[PDB]
């Protein structure tokens, strides 16, 4: 009873406010009571009591249709129109959930009512597939389903598994099953969404109006064609949606400990609280859920979260203090494995320790979170519903229609006022004429035309092997200002190349692996964690894979390693002390036979962090720190190598005397230097983008030093010094800017970032981002536009950076290959996924991005910009031309009918066919190959576009007034103050002159506004358009000329007197010249920002 306003806990990330509403019964809905109860019964009663009534009914019917559809157009309008608020939750039926800003759209979700275990009524709802339950007893608040997170580490040691099924069903009712099912919306739902679009409703209303104009045969055909076309577009959308279903996650068998026994169960029946075995699967199966590693060790590639292509070691929680509270923020880096991550390698629990062992020898782990609540699940939620689908229904299009409608209202008011001055006119025809003027001034083709233009650009893109799922985002590619790039797999290859070993020769020179000492070959060949599978495939860490391949050694199943190329004796590995994060090092015991003796000589090979072996080396080069710092500044990963010959060990001592001394008196044996190379195309494409006057920004999850180096190599940073903001490690110092070299350290100041961002380049780390978000979000928002590199950025922080850039009114482009970009790709205005390793399964990024390249080359982006500018100019040019034609139409439609002249049906038909042809040839114009330094106009609202439309219309208007008066002065005087209404078209001199002039001026209007020498193919290159303009100019000259009366008669032209012919030709030429000069002068004066 009686939950107040705003029923959510402060600090929920998804939902800002929750108000319950109950749906009204059908008869009590405001869609029916005012409709079924009042207006129609009074009309029916007047009808039974015995044409004007039907018209008044139709306007009532139209108002009703718009009110019902407005509930479809807005969930807020739907709630107001169909539901009432109810403070008592027992009587409520639905809840309208408003998400936090940027976290989607407001939805109306049904409330689920469930009986609890106690027989108590548990109210719950599911919003965006997350269940929120109302806690009625303690807090009287809605809480998200609490996962067993932040618990003490006593609970996890005592869990064993569940020997029951009632509690399992209870857990299933509370948390739900791990459902990764992609629900494909039904065809009917997408088609219903489309049929309620404002434009389609307006077009169907226009079809209804032609049915109202007695076009019985014509209206049904046009309606069927319109519906079939929208259905075909829906079919294409369904095709795009079926691939998303094709992604999903395949059901697989996993080992689960249930009812005191280990059993294989399908991954969908796993519930939180189960203890599961997680291991390297032979099918390259992904981890199904977020799991805490209880026992056993694993190397996992967490490519999904850090974007770093490099596997991270995960350690069991068994070695830690049980009193520690689980912090998901701190412990997840070392102790949590996320769902969908790949287990590269696993180490089974030691046989000596008492406890649970799985049959498959996987690691035993406890499931923390399942389904859509995992980090992958969070990504997937953003994939399904995280941005409004871009429709043709742009605010620009609606304002443009409203502008033309103001002018059409003025024209219709003029026709109404003058037609009401003549009392003889039948009011039905005057209303019909006004309605036809209103419906034809606003042509039905504008959105179809725009979609055809977009589809032509789509066909042009398909030939470049770029697929586009959301075509209406292409014009935004013309507006892109900031291009954000990921590093890994996009600008660099995922393939790591070993450059060699440094510190072997005097100086900095990296000696190639072919020229390193025999001790270095032995150190690289023995100091590895690679293993041989039963099938002989080599499995394990890519860095290690590169190391073993570069040294040309082979590992056998017996953990023996033999050289292929070097005439050295093989090594047998006996014991590995794996890399411990606490020790920052790994060691291997290997033996070799001595040359000419059967005596086994044992050796210790050590690798680890340079800072740790520095203190572990017995003899260290003086330049060790210099060399290390300089190589780390080159963005390479550096490992130190240590070597020791142990001589003869007894077989018992070699296994036991190892534990007593793992590390001491190490010999320095060099630095292994590994680089990730740049892609060969990256520098040229990035130079083209910078040359096109676009700002380049880097946003990557990789380490800041390597990312900054690669960004420098790509000229993302042209400045001499790069400053990294470090957050305070301790509560209370301010954040510090540190040079890449460390030479310059500056405190942060509340001053203007322009001064720092003019002299230095700024790189913000993810830890620094989180610190600024907690401390000063406004300074962060002021800083973001001035940063050049974002490093160690999490996917949600990538989203936040993109959204922050969008809030400043920048049009953003994101390019990525990884799922790490999915949030940014969806939220970017133009997301382009590249497939990593170009030469079927689709990685989620190729589904998440609006655009997908089948090539791993970034040159596609240059193509997208080339295409986007073309499309952006085309639509804007079309809008201008269409506005001009509409005003020409608006003035031709009523003033001429007020003067009583009409086009001939044949004349009008030919004019229409030529007009339709010209728009078809204009919409197919191609972009130029080169990216201009000049930028196109971004928006329809510019001073230039308004003033050019106004001035061209005014010129054309003055021409029409002049020629109408000259025709009236030459037309015979009419002894009638009033024009009859539907006069059978008699070819008159006035009709012929105004028609020929209107056609010539309207064709000039086509010719004048196409502008493309920096942006589109030139006029002589669009040959179809050239033929259209040449045929129309030849037609205009032939029609004006009168060498044959019969030819004019098929066209219905009257022979024009030669004296008047000369005046017409001179004024039409002057009109063309003046309108051209006007447009060119206004472009010269007002273009560019």
From Swiss-Prot:
Coiled coil: none annotated. It is an enzyme of class 7 (translocase). Glycans are attached at residues 240, 373. The keyword Lyase does not apply. Its EC number is 7.4.2.-. ATP binds at residues 486-488, 579, 637, 702, 817-821. Residues 465-494, 680-838, 841-856 are annotated as: P-domain. The active site is at residue 486. Residues 152-183, 248-388 are annotated as: A-domain. Residues 70-196, 418-880, 924-942, 1009-1023, 1079-1089 are cytoplasmic. Pfam families: 2TM_P5A-ATPase, E1-E2_ATPase. GO terms for molecular function: ABC-type manganese transporter activity; ATP binding; ATP hydrolysis activity; ATPase-coupled monoatomic cation transmembrane transporter activity; membrane protein dislocase activity; metal ion binding; P-type ion transporter activity. It is found in: Endoplasmic reticulum membrane. Signal peptide: none annotated. CDD domains: P-type_ATPase_cation. One of its GO terms (biological process) is extraction of mislocalized protein from ER membrane. PANTHER family: CATION-TRANSPORTING ATPASE-RELATED, ENDOPLASMIC RETICULUM TRANSMEMBRANE HELIX TRANSLOCASE. Endoplasmic reticulum translocase required to remove mitochondrial transmembrane proteins mistargeted to the endoplasmic reticulum. Acts as a dislocase that mediates the ATP-dependent extraction of mislocalized mitochondrial transmembrane proteins from the endoplasmic reticulum membrane. Specifically binds mitochondrial tail-anchored transmembrane proteins: has an atypically large substrate-binding pocket that recognizes and binds moderately hydrophobic transmembranes with short hydrophilic lumenal domains. Belongs to the cation transport ATPase (P-type) (TC 3.A.3) family. Type V subfamily. This is Endoplasmic reticulum transmembrane helix translocase. It comes from Homo sapiens. The gene is ATP13A1.
